[PDB]
Amino acid sequence: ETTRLTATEIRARISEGAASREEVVHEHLDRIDEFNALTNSFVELRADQVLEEARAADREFGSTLGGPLDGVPLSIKDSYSVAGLHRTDGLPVNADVLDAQDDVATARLRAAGGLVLGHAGIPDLCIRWNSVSGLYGAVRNPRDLSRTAGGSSGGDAANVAAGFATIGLGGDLGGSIRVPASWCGVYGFRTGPGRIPDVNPNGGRSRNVVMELMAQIGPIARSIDDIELAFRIMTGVDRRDTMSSPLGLIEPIEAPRVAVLRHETGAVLDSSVEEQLDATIEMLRAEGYVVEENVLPDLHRAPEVWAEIVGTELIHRVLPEVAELVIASERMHIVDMFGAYELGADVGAYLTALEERSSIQMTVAALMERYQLILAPVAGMPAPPLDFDDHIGREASIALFDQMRCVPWVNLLGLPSLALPNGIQLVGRKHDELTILAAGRAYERRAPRVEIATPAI
Amino acid sequence: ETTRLTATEIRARISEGAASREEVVHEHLDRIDEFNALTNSFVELRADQVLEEARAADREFGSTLGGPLDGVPLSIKDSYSVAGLHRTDGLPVNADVLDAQDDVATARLRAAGGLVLGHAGIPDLCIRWNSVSGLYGAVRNPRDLSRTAGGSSGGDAANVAAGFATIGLGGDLGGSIRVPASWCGVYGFRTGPGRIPDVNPNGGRSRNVVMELMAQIGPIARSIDDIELAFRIMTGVDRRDTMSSPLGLIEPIEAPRVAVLRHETGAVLDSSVEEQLDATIEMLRAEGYVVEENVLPDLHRAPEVWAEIVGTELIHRVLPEVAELVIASERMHIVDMFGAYELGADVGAYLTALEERSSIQMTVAALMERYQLILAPVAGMPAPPLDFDDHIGREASIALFDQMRCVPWVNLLGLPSLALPNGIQLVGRKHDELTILAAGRAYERRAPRVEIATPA
Numbered sequence A: 001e002t003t004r005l006t007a008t009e010i011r012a013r014i015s016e017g018a019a020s021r022e023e024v025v026h027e028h029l030d031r032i033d034e035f036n037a038l039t040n041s042f043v044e045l046r047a048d049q050v051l052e053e054a055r056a057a058d059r060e061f062g063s064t065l066g067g068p069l070d071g072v073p074l075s076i077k078d079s080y081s082v083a084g085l086h087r088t089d090g091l092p093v094n095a096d097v098l099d100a101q102d103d104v105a106t107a108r109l110r111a112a113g114g115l116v117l118g119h120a121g122i123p124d125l126c127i128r129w130n131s132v133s134g135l136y137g138a139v140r141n142p143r144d145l146s147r148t149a150g151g152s153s154g155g156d157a158a159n160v161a162a163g164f165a166t167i168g169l170g171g172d173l174g175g176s177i178r179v180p181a182s183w184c185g186v187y188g189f190r191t192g193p194g195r196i197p198d199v200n201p202n203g204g205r206s207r208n209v210v211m212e213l214m215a216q217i218g219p220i221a222r223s224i225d226d227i228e229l230a231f232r233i234m235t236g237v238d239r240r241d242t243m244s245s246p247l248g249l250i251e252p253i254e255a256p257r258v259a260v261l262r263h264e265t266g267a268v269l270d271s272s273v274e275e276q277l278d279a280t281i282e283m284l285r286a287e288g289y290v291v292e293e294n295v296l297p298d299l300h301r302a303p304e305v306w307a308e309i310v311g312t313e314l315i316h317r318v319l320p321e322v323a324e325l326v327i328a329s330e331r332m333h334i335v336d337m338f339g340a341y342e343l344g345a346d347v348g349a350y351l352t353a354l355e356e357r358s359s360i361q362m363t364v365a366a367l368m369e370r371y372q373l374i375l376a377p378v379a380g381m382p383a384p385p386l387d388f389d390d391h392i393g394r395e396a397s398i399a400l401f402d403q404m405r406c407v408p409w410v411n412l413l414g415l416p417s418l419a420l421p422n423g424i425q426l427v428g429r430k431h432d433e434l435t436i437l438a439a440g441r442a443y444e445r446r447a448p449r450v451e452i453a454t455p456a457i
Numbered sequence B: 001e002t003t004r005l006t007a008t009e010i011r012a013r014i015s016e017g018a019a020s021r022e023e024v025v026h027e028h029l030d031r032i033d034e035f036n037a038l039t040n041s042f043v044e045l046r047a048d049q050v051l052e053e054a055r056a057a058d059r060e061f062g063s064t065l066g067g068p069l070d071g072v073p074l075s076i077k078d079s080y081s082v083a084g085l086h087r088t089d090g091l092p093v094n095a096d097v098l099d100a101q102d103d104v105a106t107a108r109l110r111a112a113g114g115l116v117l118g119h120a121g122i123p124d125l126c127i128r129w130n131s132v133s134g135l136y137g138a139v140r141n142p143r144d145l146s147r148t149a150g151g152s153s154g155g156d157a158a159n160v161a162a163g164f165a166t167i168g169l170g171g172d173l174g175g176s177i178r179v180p181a182s183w184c185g186v187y188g189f190r191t192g193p194g195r196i197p198d199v200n201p202n203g204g205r206s207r208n209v210v211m212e213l214m215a216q217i218g219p220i221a222r223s224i225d226d227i228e229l230a231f232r233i234m235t236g237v238d239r240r241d242t243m244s245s246p247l248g249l250i251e252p253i254e255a256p257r258v259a260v261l262r263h264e265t266g267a268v269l270d271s272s273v274e275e276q277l278d279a280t281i282e283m284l285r286a287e288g289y290v291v292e293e294n295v296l297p298d299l300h301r302a303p304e305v306w307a308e309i310v311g312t313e314l315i316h317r318v319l320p321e322v323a324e325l326v327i328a329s330e331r332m333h334i335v336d337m338f339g340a341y342e343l344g345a346d347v348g349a350y351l352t353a354l355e356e357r358s359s360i361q362m363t364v365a366a367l368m369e370r371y372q373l374i375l376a377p378v379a380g381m382p383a384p385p386l387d388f389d390d391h392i393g394r395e396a397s398i399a400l401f402d403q404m405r406c407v408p409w410v411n412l413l414g415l416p417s418l419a420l421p422n423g424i425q426l427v428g429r430k431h432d433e434l435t436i437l438a439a440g441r442a443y444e445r446r447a448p449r450v451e452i453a454t455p456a
């Protein structure tokens, strides 16, 4: 039953002598053993190794808690190095990549006492809203096994939603935290520029700054307290990441005004999503926020410019290098969807798109001085069937992109955003993470508490 | 007399009752009237309006000093909006672009009491190490009128070196502060990421983030105190610039080690420049710095990657749009020089260059954890003749680029750097501006005082 509990509640049990760390870990591992065959969400376990950590801490500390994550089991996305685990990007060709060292973000979670159970499932290359890999197969939604878990952090979202771990760690370049979190009915927090360093001491490939500006690390959890705890532990400068900053956290702003994004990026929304947006508007208003509809300009270009920039790179640089190493469904997702938006081979087109990005960014930054939070859908539909994006072709891929238009503008503009379990998100300005989490509590105080799913056919 | 003085000294004259603000402004405007025909460095004045400002302050305040730049005459590069002045980018087609509002950096200088005398000369598009425009012609070096003032902030540097203003405001994407400051024998401080916001409320042309990451605003002046004063006044978040940060200034590092960059970026250096580098090494050693030579790796790709990234954009995006609007020497500088490095039309090559930028940045960031300051030449030669880059062709442009190889790597990697009046610079890590300025002061304690030139 610690599988149903938040970090604070688990630590309370440990503090009172009601459970040992070893017992907490055993409960999660037993649950994983019972149901992970169905979800396929923990793809590489370190069961023996984490049990050793738990027992060691029990022997040394007993019911005294050490660091602020002592006793809390974690899921980590395959992409983030954990010393002694493999980092594969889903690809069989990388099955031999075994890391000697943690990434900085993972190191901080572990140094604080976090008990990493294993690596979580992902799509090949981490470029998909569906966590299907050549090495591990498909992650299924624990809330309904016929449905996608989302992606690219689908494994972590699924592990948290199923009670396999208390907190997960993902990344978000095009919705990789927010999409699976919302589709699995949990919280997912995409942090903002400067806070959490992305440092891999094992040696990563080197990236285009344009892509790095759109990507951030963040936690997935079943409560905002757990989101905040993981966020605070991971935040801090490391000068090995050029985009990391020594800037401290900024206290939540008094009385931010909230703008509603509904159709202003051209998204095609299900009635159920429109109804969740309406409900979330009213939760914020009841909390005392001023929330305004129909105040944003026409921003249909924002997700399109994201797809142009990302798609051009995927089609003209990435795919030529990795085409034969990825599963057919990954290749064809990139061709079918990003092929609709990629700008061709002329550098002049790519440069023009980069200028448009800056123009949109300027417009939105100016308006967010007035509307410091934007409330928006995440996906335009609830979790779709598992094969929703598998060899669906150009026309259907454009229709999918249209359903997801409230997602990737956030990445384009480099903004933090909290995805709520009901598929709505709170987007804030750069550096205003704590304002976002405060607003999130307006939802948390009113919506039913997140409960773990028991996967069943 | 106030034309020779630093900001602190001018303000002391006002405090003493020895000069009014109006008299300070008159002395500078009179000097401009006498010599600006030779330098062509102040290209548009607001003489009546700035005298009005000085008189209003004199009436209300008398010898009481107001804000921290009260009484201090300023030069502002054409590129940075000043309310009531035109912003032309040197192009006759833009001679009617009149701004209603200050840029944020300009507004902060003015709000602090600074007295903007006018706009300073520039090259067409601000893409050149020589401040030659279609609208205003050539800025000439006040220290030697046969020589370039540098660019693209050549007007501001010349104005400060000639005593037409106390402090100037420029920008630096490929040396635009450091090159003209050094060639005019004054200080020029390229600030680092996050510090000074670049916000034009009148509507600036939108720019590629890649270029924006390499560009920073900063002051030109005749002392470190004046550099620091202007720097601190302009620093502060403005969220309209998404690159600006609320991060404060960081106190100078205790005992930073200094790495010497001489030939490691492939630069071809004059003997006089090598000797200025040696002299500065000894000045810093005498002030207690540990300075080490031959500690840097082979960084010859750093300036090349800058030229590839910049050049590809200039050739494939900028020139197609403005080719008929710029003087032929500006067009041909781009073709002759950047044409040697541009990557061609394939987006794949540009993406590859972007990846290499990140790799170099990470390598240099790691080594600057040990060597927190890099000491380097700016240009490989003292200020060249005014025609040095005028329709020179491909081979000559490669030779010129090789002479300038210690300059643009700083931009590529997003680093702050102070150019000293002798053509040497002090480069620091991101956010470490005050450590740089401390080392600048060490130079200033050992070197001759900067004096203004009288153009003749």
Ligand SMILES: NNC(=O)c1ccc(O)cc1
Binding pocket: A126, A127, A128, A129, A151, A152, A171, A172, A173, A174, A175, A176, A177
């Ligand atoms: N990590 N990856 C992402 O956030 C992401 C997810 C889906 C994409 O089409 C592109 C990027």
Ligand SMILES: NNC(=O)c1ccc(O)cc1
Binding pocket: B126, B127, B128, B129, B151, B152, B171, B172, B173, B174, B175, B176, B177
């Ligand atoms: N602002 N402009 C610069 O710093 C700059 C200077 C010289 C160039 O070839 C390109 C840019």
